[PDB]
């Protein structure tokens, strides 16, 4: 979720995780992915 990306050092987006980074979870509900 939200807060385990953002204090896990990851970015929630709803894209493709950007270039060096991986799907590491997800956010808003589901909906987004947690990227790290």
Known sequence: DHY?????????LY???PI???I??????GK???CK
Do not use: D, H, L, P
């Open 4 to 12: 385990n990306c953002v204090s896990s050092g990851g970015q929630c």
């Open 15 to 17: 894209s493709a995780c």
């Open 20 to 22: 060096f980074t991986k």
């Open 24 to 29: 590491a979870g997800t956010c808003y509900r």
């Open 32 to 34: 987004a992915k947690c």
